[PDB]
mmCIF file of C-alpha atoms and ligand atoms in Angstrom:
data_model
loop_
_atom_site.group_PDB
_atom_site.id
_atom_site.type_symbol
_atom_site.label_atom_id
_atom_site.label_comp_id
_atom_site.label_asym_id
_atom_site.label_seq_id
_atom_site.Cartn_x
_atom_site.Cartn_y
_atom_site.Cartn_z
ATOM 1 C CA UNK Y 1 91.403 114.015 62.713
ATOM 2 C CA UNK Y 2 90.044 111.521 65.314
ATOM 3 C CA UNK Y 3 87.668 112.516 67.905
ATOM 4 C CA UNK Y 4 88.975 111.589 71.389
ATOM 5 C CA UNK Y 5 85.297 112.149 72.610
ATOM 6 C CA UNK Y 6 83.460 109.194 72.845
ATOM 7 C CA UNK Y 7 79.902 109.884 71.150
ATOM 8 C CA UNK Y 8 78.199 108.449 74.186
ATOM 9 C CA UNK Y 9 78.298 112.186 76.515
ATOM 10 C CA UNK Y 10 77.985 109.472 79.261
ATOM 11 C CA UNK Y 11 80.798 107.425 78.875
ATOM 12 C CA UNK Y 12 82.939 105.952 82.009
ATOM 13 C CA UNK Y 13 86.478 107.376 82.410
ATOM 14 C CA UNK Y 14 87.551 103.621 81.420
ATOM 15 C CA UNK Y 15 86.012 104.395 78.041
ATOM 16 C CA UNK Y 16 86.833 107.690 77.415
ATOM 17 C CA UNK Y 17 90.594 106.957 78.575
ATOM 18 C CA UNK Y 18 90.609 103.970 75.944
ATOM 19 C CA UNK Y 19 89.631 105.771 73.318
ATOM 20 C CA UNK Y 20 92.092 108.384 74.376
ATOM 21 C CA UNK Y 21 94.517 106.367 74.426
ATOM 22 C CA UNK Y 22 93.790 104.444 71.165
ATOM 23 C CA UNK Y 23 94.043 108.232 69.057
ATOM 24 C CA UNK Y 24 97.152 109.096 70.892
ATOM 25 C CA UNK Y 25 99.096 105.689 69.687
ATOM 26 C CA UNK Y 26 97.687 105.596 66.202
ATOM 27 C CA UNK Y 27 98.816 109.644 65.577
ATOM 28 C CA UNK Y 28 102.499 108.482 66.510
ATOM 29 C CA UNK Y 29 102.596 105.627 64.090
ATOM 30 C CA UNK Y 30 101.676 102.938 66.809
ATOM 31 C CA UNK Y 31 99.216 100.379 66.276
ATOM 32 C CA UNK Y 32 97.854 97.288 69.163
ATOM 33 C CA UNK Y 33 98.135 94.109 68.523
ATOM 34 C CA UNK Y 34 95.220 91.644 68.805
ATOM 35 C CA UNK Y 35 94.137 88.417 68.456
ATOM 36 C CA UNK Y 36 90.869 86.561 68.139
ATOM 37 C CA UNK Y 37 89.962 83.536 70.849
ATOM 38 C CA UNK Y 38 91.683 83.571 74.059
ATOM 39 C CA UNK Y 39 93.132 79.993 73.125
ATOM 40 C CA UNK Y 40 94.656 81.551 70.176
ATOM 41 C CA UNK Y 41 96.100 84.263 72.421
ATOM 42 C CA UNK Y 42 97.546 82.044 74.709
ATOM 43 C CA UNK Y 43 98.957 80.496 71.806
ATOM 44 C CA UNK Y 44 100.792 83.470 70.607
ATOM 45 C CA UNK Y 45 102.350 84.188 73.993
ATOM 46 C CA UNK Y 46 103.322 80.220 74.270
ATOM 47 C CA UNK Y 47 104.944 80.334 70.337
ATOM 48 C CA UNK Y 48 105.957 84.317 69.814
ATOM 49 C CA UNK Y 49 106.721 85.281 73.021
ATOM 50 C CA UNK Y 50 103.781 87.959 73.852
ATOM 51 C CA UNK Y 51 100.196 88.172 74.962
ATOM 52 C CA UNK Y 52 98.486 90.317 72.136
ATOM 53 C CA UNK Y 53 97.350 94.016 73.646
ATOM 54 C CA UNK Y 54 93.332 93.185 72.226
ATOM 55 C CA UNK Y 55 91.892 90.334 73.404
ATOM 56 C CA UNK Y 56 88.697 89.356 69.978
ATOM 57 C CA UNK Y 57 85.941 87.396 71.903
ATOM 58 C CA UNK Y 58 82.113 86.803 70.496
ATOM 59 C CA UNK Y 59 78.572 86.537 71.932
ATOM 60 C CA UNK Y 60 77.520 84.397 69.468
ATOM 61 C CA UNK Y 61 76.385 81.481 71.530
ATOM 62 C CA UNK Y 62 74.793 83.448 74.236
ATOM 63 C CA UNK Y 63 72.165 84.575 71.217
ATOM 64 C CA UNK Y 64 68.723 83.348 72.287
ATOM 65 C CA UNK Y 65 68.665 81.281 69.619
ATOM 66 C CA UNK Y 66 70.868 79.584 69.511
ATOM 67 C CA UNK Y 67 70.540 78.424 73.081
ATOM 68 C CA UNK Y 68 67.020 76.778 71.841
ATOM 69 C CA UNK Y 69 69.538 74.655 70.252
ATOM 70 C CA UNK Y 70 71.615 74.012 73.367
ATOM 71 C CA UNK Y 71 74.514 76.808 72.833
ATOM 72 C CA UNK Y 72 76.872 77.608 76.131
ATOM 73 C CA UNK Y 73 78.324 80.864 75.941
ATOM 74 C CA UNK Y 74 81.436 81.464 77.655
ATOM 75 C CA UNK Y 75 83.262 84.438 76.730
ATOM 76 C CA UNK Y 76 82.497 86.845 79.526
ATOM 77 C CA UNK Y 77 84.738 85.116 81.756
ATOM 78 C CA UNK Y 78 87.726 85.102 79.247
ATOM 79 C CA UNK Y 79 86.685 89.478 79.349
ATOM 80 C CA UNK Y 80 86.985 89.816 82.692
ATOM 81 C CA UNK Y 81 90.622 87.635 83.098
ATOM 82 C CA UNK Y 82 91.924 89.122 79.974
ATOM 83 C CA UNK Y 83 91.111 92.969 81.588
ATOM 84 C CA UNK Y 84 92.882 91.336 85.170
ATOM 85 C CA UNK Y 85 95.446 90.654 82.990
ATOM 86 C CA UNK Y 86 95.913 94.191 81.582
ATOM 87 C CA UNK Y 87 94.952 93.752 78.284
ATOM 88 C CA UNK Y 88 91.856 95.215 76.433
ATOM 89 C CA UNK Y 89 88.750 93.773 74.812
ATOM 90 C CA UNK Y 90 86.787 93.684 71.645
ATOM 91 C CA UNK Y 91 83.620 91.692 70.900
ATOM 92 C CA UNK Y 92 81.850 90.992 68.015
ATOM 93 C CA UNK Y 93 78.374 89.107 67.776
ATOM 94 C CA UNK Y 94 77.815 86.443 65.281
ATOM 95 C CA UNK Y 95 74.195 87.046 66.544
ATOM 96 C CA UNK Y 96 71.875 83.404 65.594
ATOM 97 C CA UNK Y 97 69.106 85.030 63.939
ATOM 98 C CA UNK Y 98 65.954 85.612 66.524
ATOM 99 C CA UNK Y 99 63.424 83.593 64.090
ATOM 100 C CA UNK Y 100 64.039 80.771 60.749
ATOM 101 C CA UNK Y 101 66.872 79.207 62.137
ATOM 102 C CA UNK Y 102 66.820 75.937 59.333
ATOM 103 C CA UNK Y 103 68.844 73.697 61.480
ATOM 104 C CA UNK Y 104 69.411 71.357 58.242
ATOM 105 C CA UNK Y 105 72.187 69.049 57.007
ATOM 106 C CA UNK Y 106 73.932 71.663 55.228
ATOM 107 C CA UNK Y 107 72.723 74.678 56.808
ATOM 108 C CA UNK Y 108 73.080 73.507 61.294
ATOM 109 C CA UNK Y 109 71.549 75.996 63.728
ATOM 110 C CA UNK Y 110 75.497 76.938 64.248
ATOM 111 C CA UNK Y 111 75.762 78.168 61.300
ATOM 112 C CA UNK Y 112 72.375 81.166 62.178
ATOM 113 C CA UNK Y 113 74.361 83.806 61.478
ATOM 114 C CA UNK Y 114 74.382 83.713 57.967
ATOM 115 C CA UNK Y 115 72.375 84.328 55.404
ATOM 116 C CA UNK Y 116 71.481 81.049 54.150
ATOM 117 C CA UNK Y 117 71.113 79.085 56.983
ATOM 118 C CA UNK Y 118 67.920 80.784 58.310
ATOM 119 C CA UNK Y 119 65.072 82.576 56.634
ATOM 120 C CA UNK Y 120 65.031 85.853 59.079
ATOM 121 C CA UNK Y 121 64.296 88.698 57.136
ATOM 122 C CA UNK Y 122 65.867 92.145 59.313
ATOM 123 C CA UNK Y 123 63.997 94.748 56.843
ATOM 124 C CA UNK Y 124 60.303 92.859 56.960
ATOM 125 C CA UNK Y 125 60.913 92.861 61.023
ATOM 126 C CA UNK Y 126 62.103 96.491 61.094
ATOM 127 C CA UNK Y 127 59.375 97.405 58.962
ATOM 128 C CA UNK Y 128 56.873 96.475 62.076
ATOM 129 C CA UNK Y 129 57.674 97.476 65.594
ATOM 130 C CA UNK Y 130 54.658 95.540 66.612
ATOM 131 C CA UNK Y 131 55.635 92.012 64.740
ATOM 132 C CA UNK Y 132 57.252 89.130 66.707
ATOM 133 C CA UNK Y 133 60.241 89.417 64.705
ATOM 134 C CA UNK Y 134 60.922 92.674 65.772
ATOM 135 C CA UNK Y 135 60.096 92.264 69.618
ATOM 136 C CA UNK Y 136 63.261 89.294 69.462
ATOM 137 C CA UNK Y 137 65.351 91.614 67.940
ATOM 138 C CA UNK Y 138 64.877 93.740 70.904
ATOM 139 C CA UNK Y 139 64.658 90.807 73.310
ATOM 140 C CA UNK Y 140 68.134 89.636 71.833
ATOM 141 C CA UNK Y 141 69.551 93.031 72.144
ATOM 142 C CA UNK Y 142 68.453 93.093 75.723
ATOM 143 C CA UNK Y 143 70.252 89.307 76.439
ATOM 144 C CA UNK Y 144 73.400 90.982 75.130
ATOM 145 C CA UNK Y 145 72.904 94.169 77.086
ATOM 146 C CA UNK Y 146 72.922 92.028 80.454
ATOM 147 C CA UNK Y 147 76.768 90.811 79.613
ATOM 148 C CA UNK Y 148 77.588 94.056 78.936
ATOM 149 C CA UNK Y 149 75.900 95.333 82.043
ATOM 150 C CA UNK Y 150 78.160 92.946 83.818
ATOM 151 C CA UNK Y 151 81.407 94.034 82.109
ATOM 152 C CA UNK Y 152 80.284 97.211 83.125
ATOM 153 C CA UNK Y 153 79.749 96.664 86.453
ATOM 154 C CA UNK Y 154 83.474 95.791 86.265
ATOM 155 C CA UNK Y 155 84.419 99.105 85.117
ATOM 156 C CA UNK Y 156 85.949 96.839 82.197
ATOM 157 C CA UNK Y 157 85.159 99.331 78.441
ATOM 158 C CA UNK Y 158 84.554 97.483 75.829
ATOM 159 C CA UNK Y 159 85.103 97.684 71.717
ATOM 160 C CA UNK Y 160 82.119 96.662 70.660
ATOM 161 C CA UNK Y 161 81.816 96.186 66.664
ATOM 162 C CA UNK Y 162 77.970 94.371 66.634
ATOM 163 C CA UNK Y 163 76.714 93.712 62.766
ATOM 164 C CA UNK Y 164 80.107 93.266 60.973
ATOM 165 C CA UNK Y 165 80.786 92.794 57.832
ATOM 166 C CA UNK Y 166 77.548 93.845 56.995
ATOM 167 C CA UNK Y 167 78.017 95.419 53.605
ATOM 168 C CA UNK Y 168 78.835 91.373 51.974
ATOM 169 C CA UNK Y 169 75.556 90.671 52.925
ATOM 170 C CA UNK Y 170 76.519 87.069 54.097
ATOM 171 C CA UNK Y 171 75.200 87.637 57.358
ATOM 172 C CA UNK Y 172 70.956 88.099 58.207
ATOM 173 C CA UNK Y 173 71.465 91.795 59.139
ATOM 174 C CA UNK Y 174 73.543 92.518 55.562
ATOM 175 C CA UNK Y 175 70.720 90.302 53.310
ATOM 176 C CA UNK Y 176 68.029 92.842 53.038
ATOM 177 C CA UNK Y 177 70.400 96.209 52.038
ATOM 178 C CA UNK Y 178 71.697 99.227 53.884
ATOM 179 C CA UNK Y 179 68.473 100.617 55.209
ATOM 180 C CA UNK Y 180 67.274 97.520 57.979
ATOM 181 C CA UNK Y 181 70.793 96.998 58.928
ATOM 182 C CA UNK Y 182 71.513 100.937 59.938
ATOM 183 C CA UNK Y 183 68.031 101.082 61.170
ATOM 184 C CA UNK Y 184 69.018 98.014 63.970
ATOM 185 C CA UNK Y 185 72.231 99.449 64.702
ATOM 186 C CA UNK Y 186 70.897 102.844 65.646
ATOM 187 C CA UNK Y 187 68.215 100.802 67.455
ATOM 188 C CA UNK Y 188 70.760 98.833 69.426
ATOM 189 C CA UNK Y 189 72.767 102.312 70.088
ATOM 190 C CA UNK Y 190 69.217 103.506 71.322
ATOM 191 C CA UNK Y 191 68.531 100.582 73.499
ATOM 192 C CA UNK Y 192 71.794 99.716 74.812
ATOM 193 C CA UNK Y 193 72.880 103.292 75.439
ATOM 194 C CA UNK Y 194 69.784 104.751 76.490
ATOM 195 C CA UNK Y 195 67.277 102.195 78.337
ATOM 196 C CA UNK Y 196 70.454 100.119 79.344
ATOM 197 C CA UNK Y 197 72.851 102.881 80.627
ATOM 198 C CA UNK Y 198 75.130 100.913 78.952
ATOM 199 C CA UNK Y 199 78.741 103.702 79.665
ATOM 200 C CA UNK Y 200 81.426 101.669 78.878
ATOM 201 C CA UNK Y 201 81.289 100.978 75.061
ATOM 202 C CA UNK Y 202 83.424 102.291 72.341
ATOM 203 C CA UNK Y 203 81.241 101.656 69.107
ATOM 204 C CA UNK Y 204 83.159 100.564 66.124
ATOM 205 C CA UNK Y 205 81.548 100.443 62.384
ATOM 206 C CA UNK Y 206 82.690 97.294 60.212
ATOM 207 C CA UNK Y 207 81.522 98.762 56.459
ATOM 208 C CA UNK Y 208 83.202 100.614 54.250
ATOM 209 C CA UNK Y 209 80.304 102.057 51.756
ATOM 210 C CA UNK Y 210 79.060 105.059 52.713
ATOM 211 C CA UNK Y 211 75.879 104.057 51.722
ATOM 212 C CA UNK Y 212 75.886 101.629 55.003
ATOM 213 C CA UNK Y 213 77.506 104.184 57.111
ATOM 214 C CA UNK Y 214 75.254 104.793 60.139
ATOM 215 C CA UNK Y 215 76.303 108.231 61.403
ATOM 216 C CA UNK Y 216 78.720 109.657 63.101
ATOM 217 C CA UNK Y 217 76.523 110.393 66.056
ATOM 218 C CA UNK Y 218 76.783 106.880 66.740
ATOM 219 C CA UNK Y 219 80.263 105.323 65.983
ATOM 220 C CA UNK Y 220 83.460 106.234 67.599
ATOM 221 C CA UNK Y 221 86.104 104.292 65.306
ATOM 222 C CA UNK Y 222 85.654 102.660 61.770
ATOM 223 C CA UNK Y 223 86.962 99.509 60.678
ATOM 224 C CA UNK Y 224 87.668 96.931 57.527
ATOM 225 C CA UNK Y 225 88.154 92.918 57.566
ATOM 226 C CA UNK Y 226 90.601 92.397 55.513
ATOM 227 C CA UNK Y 227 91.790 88.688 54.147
ATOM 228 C CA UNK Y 228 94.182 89.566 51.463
ATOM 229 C CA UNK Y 229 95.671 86.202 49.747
ATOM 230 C CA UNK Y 230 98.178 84.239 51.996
ATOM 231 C CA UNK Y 231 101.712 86.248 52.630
ATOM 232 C CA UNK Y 232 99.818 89.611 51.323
ATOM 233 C CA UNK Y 233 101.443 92.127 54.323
ATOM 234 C CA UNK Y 234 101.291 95.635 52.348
ATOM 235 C CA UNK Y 235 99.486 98.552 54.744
ATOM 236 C CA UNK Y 236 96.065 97.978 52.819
ATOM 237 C CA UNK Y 237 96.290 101.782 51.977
ATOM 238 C CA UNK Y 238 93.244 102.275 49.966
ATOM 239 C CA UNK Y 239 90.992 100.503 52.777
ATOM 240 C CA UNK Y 240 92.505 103.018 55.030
ATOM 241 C CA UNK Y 241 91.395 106.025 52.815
ATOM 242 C CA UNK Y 242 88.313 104.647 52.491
ATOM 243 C CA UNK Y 243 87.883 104.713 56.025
ATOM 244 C CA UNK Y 244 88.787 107.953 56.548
ATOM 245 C CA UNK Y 245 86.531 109.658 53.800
ATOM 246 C CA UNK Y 246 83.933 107.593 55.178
ATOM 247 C CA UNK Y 247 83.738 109.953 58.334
ATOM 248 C CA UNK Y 248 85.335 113.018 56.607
ATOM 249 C CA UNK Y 249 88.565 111.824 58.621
ATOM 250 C CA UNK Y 250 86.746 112.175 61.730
ATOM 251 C CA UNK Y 251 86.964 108.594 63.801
ATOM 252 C CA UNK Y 252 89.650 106.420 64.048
ATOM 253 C CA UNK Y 253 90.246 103.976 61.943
ATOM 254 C CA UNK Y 254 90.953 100.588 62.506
ATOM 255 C CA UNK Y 255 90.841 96.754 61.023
ATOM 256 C CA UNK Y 256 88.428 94.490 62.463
ATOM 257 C CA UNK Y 257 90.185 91.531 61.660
ATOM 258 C CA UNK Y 258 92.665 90.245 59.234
ATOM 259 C CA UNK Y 259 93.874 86.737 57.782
ATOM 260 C CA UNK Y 260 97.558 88.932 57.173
ATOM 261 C CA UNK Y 261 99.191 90.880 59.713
ATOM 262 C CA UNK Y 262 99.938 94.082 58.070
ATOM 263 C CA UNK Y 263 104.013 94.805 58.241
ATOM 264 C CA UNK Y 264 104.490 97.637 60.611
ATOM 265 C CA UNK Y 265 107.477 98.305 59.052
ATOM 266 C CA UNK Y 266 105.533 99.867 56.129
ATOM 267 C CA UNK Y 267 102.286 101.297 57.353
ATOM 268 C CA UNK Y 268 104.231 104.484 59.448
ATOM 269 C CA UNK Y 269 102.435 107.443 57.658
ATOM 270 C CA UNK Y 270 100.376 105.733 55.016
ATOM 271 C CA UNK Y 271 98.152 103.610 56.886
ATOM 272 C CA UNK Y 272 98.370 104.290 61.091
ATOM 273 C CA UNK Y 273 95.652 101.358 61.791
ATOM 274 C CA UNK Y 274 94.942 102.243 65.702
ATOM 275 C CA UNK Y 275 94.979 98.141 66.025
ATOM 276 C CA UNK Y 276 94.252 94.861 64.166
ATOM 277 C CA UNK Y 277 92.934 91.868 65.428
ATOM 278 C CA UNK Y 278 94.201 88.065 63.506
ATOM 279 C CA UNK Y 279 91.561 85.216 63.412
ATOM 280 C CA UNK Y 280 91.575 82.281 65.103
ATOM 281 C CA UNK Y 281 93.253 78.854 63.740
ATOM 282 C CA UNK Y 282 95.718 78.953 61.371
ATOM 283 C CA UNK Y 283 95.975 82.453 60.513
ATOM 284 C CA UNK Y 284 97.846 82.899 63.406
ATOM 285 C CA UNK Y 285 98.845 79.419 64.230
ATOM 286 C CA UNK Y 286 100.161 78.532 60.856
ATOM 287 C CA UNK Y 287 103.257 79.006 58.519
ATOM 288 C CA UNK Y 288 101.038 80.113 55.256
ATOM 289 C CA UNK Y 289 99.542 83.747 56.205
ATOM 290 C CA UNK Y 290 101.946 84.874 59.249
ATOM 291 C CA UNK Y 291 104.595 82.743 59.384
ATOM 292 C CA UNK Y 292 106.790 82.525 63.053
ATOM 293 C CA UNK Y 293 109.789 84.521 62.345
ATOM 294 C CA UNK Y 294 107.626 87.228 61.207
ATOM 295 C CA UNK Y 295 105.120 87.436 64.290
ATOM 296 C CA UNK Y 296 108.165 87.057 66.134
ATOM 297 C CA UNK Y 297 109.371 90.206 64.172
ATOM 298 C CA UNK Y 298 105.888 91.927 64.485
ATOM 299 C CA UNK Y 299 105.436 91.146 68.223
ATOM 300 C CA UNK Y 300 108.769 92.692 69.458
ATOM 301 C CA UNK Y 301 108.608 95.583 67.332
ATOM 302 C CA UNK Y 302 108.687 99.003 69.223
ATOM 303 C CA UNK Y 303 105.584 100.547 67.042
ATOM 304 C CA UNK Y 304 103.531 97.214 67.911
ATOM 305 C CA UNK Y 305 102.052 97.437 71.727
ATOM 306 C CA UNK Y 306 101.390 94.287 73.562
ATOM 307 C CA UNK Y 307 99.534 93.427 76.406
ATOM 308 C CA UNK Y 308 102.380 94.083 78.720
ATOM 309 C CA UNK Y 309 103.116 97.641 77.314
ATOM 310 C CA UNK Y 310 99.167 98.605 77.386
ATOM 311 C CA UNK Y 311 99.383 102.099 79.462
ATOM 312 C CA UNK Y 312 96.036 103.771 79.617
HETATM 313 O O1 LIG P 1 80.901 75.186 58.636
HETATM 314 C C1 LIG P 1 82.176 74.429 58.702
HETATM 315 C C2 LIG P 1 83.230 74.950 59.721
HETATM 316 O O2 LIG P 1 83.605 73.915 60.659
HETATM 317 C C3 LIG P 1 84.478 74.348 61.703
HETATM 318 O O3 LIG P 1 83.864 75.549 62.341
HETATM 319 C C4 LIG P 1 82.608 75.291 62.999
HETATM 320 C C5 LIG P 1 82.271 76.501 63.882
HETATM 321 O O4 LIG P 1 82.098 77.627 63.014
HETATM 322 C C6 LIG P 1 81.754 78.836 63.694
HETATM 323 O O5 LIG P 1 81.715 79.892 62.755
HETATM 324 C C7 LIG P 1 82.993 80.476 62.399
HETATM 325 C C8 LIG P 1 83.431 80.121 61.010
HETATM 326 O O6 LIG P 1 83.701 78.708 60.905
HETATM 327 C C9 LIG P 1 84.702 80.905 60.630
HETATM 328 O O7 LIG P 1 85.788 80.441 61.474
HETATM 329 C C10 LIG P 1 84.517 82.419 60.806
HETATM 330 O O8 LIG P 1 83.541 82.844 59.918
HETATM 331 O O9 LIG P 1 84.026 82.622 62.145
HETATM 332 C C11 LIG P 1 82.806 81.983 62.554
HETATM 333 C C12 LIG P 1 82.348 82.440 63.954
HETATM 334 O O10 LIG P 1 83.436 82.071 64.905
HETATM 335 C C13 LIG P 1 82.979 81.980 66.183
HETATM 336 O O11 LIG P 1 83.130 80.717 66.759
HETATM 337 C C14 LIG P 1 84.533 80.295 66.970
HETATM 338 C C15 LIG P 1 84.573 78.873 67.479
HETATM 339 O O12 LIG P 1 83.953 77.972 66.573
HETATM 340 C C16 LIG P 1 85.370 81.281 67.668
HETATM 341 O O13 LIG P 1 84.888 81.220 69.126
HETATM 342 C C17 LIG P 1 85.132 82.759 67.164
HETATM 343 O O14 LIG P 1 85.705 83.676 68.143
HETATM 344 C C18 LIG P 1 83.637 83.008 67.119
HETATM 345 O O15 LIG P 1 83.661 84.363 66.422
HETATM 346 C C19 LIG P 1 80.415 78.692 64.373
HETATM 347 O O16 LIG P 1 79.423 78.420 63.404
HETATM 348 C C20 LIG P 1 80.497 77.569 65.390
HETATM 349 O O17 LIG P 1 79.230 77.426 66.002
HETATM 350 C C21 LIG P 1 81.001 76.289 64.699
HETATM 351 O O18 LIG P 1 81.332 75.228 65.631
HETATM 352 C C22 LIG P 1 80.199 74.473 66.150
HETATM 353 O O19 LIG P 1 79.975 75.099 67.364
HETATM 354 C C23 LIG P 1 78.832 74.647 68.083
HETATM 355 C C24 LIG P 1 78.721 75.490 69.343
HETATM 356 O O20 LIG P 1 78.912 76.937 68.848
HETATM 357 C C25 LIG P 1 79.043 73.185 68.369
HETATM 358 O O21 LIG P 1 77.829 72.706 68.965
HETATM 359 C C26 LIG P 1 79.344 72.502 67.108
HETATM 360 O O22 LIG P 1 79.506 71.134 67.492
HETATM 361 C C27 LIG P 1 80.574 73.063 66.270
HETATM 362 O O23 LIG P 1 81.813 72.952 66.984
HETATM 363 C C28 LIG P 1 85.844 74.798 61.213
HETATM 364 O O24 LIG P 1 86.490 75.354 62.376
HETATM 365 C C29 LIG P 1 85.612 75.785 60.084
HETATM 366 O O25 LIG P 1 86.856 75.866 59.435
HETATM 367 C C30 LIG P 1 84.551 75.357 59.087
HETATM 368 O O26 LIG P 1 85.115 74.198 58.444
HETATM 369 C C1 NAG P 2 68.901 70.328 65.027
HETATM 370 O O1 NAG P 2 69.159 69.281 64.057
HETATM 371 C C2 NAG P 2 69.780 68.122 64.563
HETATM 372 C C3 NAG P 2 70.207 67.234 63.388
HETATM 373 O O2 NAG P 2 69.079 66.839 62.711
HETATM 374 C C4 NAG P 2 68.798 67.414 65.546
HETATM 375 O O3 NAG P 2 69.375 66.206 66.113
HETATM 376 C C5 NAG P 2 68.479 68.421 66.645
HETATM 377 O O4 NAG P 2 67.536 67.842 67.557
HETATM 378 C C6 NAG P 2 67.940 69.751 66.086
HETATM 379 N N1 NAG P 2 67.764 70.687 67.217
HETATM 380 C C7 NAG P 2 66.573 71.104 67.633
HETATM 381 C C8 NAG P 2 66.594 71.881 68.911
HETATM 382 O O5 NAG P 2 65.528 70.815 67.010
HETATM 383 CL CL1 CL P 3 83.208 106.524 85.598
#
């Protein structure tokens, strides 16, 4: 069943009471809501009538690369009101690759993240600890560290699910197969955890193959992004038995995002997602994926937690 422990033997009472409180919920057939953007959560509380419980932010444009090109981030300030606010936070990092950024017509530095629009090749730079490629991989690890450093500093934990996706291998750290990308996410772990002190982080996973599984040493919950066709609201049962066998049923399990929000309804004791977390734009703000009457439905429903029922 789920560990409660955080794998960190150092984390914060704010993380260890999160995750706590995350296993308890999801073992009584309760799952968090969440939402992606803080726009989009405003929007759900303006339209459905509730501030989501997770609160989906990126540091994307606070990547060193990208602010060669002129990026802004501003997401740690939407962290630290959406924790005044009682709510709880997850980022992700659509990190701008650290070198080969193409900045073309098809392929704009905004688009570094992904595979094609930059010629960074993760396994050649993990290959070398003493190539330049591999001292901005570190460098950009320690950038991110810094935010994190400040979140912690705020005694605000954090659900931190770096390299996602990485199995589909449209993003630099999936191109090059499973080896480079677990290799930089136990160096990250290392870094942050270690030479950073970094206390307040929950570590989530984002692949389902066990042959990109990094070790259970190092990840506290497992997730799936799911983006079934439009309407599609079954519990996504077989993702959820992936995840389990993927730790030998060992870490909670979670979705990272989704395009559908599953039905709670149906997922009580076939699928007890601990949260999920909709995209941005019209996934949420449309009528095709989640129309209103349902999120109204979902939002309201007693095994859904919002931000106003969080209780940690
Ligand atoms: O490539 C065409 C694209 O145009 C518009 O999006 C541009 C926007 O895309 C960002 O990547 C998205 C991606 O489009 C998709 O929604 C999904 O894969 O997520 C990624 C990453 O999302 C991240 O950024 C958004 C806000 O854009 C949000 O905060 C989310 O939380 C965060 O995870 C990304 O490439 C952006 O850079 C890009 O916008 C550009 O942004 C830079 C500054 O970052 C500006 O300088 C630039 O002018 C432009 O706005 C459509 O929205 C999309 O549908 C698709 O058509
Ligand atoms: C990225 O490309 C655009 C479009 O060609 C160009 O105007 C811009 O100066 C480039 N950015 C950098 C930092 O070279
Ligand atoms: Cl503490």
């Amino acid at each position: 069943a789920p560990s409660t422990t955080p794998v960190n033997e150092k984390a914060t009472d704010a993380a260890k009471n999160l995750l706590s409180y995350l296993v308890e919920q999801a073992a009584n057939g309760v799952t968090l809501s969440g939402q992606q953007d803080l726009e989009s959560a405003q929007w759900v509380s303006d339209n459905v009538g509730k501030w989501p419980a997770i609160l989906g932010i990126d540091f994307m444009d606070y990547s060193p690369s990208r602010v060669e090109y002129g990026a802004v981030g501003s997401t740690v300030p939407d962290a630290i009101s959406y924790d005044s606010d009682g709510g709880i936070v997850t980022f992700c990092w659509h990190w701008g690759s650290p070198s080969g950024t193409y900045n073309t017509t098809d392929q704009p530095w905004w688009s570094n993240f992904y595979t094609e629009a930059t010629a960074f090749d993760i396994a050649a730079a993990m290959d070398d600890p003493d190539s330049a490629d591999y001292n901005l991989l570190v460098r950009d690890i320690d950038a991110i560290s810094e935010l994190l450093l400040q979140l912690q500093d705020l005694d605000i934990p954090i659900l931190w699910r770096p390299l996602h996706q990485a199995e589909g291998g449209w993003f630099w750290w999936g191109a090059k197969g499973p080896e480079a990308c677990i290799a930089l996410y136990r160096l990250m772990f290392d870094r942050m955890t270690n030479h950073h002190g970094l206390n307040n982080l929950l570590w989530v996973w984002n692949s389902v193959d066990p042959s990109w599984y990094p070790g259970n040493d190092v990840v506290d919950i497992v997730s799936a992004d799911i983006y079934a066709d439009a309407g599609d609201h079954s519990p996504q049962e077989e993702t959820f038995a992936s995840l389990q066998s993927l730790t030998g049923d060992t870490k909670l399990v979670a979705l990272g995002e989704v395009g559908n929000i599953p039905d709670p309804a149906s997922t009580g004791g076939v699928a007890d997602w601990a949260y999920w977390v909709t995209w941005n734009g019209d996934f949420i703000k449309g009528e095709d994926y989640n129309p209103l009457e349902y999120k109204k439905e979902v939002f309201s429903a007693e095994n859904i937690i919002t931000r106003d029922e969080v209780d940690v």
